Copies of this chain bind each other. A is one copy, B any other.
Amino acid sequence: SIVVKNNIHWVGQRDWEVRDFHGTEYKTLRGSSYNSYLIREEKNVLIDTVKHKFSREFVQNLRNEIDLADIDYIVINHAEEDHAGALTELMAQIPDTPIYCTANAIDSINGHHHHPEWNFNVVKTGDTLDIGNGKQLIFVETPMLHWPDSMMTYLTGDAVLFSNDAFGQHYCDEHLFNDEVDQTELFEQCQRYYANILTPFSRLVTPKITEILGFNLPVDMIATSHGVVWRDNPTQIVELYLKWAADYQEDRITIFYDTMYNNTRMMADAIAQGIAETDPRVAVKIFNVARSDKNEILTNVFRSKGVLVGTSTMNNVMMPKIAGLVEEMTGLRFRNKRASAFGSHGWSGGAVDRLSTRLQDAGFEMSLSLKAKWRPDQDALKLCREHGREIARQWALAPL
């Protein structure tokens, strides 16, 4: 194990090979980690666990650190499989150990493990737990961040905020602290995390952070359930969350599409040029949804002021990958963004209008659509380049 601070010991699990989270909806390109902590004062407290597949390693490593019978309290900030998956394995050795968690946590913990006979202790915001030596744990309820059972645990004296998922990122490294890792790679994974997971709950992030800051509690470190431990200016990740939650957007336009014969692709490239030559301030990214990483697309959309989505008509409907991605954006609930649909068709078409409607349903302020028949000739590409001009002038953050 690794010493986090004083009597705080990291007993989690690094996952270098992991590439798929939430099934296949979140690609972890730089691996991930599952942070579990063992506090050893007068009382011994285990905070969260690890993935189920590493349950055997978790219990064995935990034995080498401390006798399982000497563990007093178990804390579950979150009952998702990647944090409470090894719970059943552990409770088999110490079934009488009390479990501190939220009321919703009992529903989620029992929902996965089916061991309601366990000794649960429902906690709510303001509740405290003495561990001796003048130190105590303070619990803060954070429902829908990102789960109904989510909560944070604060350790007095050491000033360590166990935030679980919050302020975490999927980044695997042998070093434990934020000031010991690559800053660029760290920022990319942090932003990648919020944009794909916490975006729809942005309206709850600001008020909750304000509430926690209102407690006037000192924060020396922020120990999340994923990635590094924030010790050097740990409040920096909290500030980013404040910015990201405020309907974050840069002067950027993201264009993505699906194509069978590149007709729609040629439209996208023409649109980008029309934008770039109209507003040099705007950064432009283009992705083929079939050839690109879905999570990178969503991260840019989160950063963008507006997007253009392209699709060709296939059997009177839009292409499946485009339909699927739009369905996903509807769940993320992006705010204060604009959208414009485009694409090519053969005869009757109809996929472009279909897509435009669903983008509006997803919450985007819709501009006019751009349509073309078969492969665009020189005259058609002028219109597509013109469409980019019209979009750039409309979506301008400032004059000129």
Contacts and interface: CB of A to CB of B under 8 A. Distances in A.
A176 B319 CA distance: 34
Interface centre among A148, A294, A323, A324, by most chain B C-beta atoms within 10 angstroms, is A324
A327 B318 contact: yes
CB-CB nearest 10 A-B residue pairs: A315-B331, A111-B374, A324-B324, A320-B324, A323-B327, A23-B260, A317-B331, A320-B328, A24-B290, A22-B260
A147 B345 CA distance: 12
Contacts of A316: 331
A347 B108 CA distance: 9
Nearest to A24: B290
A105 to B, nearest CB: 12
Nearest to A327: B323
Contacts of A104: 347
Given A320-B327, A325-B320, A328-B320, A200 B260 contact: no
How many copies altogether?
A: 2
A174 interface: no
A317 B330 contact: yes
Given A315-B333, A317-B327, A323-B327, 4 more contacts: A22-B314, A25-B319, A322-B324, A324-B327
Interface in A194-226: 200
B290 A315 contact: no
A23 B319 contact: yes
Nearest to A290: B24
A26 to B, nearest CB: 9
A9 interface: no
A233 to B, nearest CB: 32
Contact of A81 (B261, B315, B347, B373): B261
Contacts of A294: 320
Interface centre among A111, A147, A148, A375, by most chain B C-beta atoms within 10 angstroms, is A111
Interface in A123-152: 147-148
A24 B319 CA distance: 10
A347 B314 contact: no
A242 to B, nearest CB: 22
26 contacts: A22-B260, A23-B260, A23-B261, A25-B260, A25-B319, A25-B320, A81-B261, A104-B347, A108-B374, A111-B373, A111-B375, A112-B374, A314-B331, A315-B328, A315-B332, A316-B331, A317-B328, A317-B330, A318-B327, A320-B325, A320-B328, A321-B324, A323-B324, A323-B328, A324-B324, A324-B327
Given A320-B327, A324-B327, A327-B320, A347 B148 contact: yes
Interface in A91-113: 104, 108, 111-112
A377 B112 CA distance: 9
A63 interface: no
A28 interface: no
Contacts of A319: 23, 25
Given A108-B346, A324-B323, A315 B148 contact: no
A165 interface: no
A301 to B, nearest CB: 14
A279 interface: no
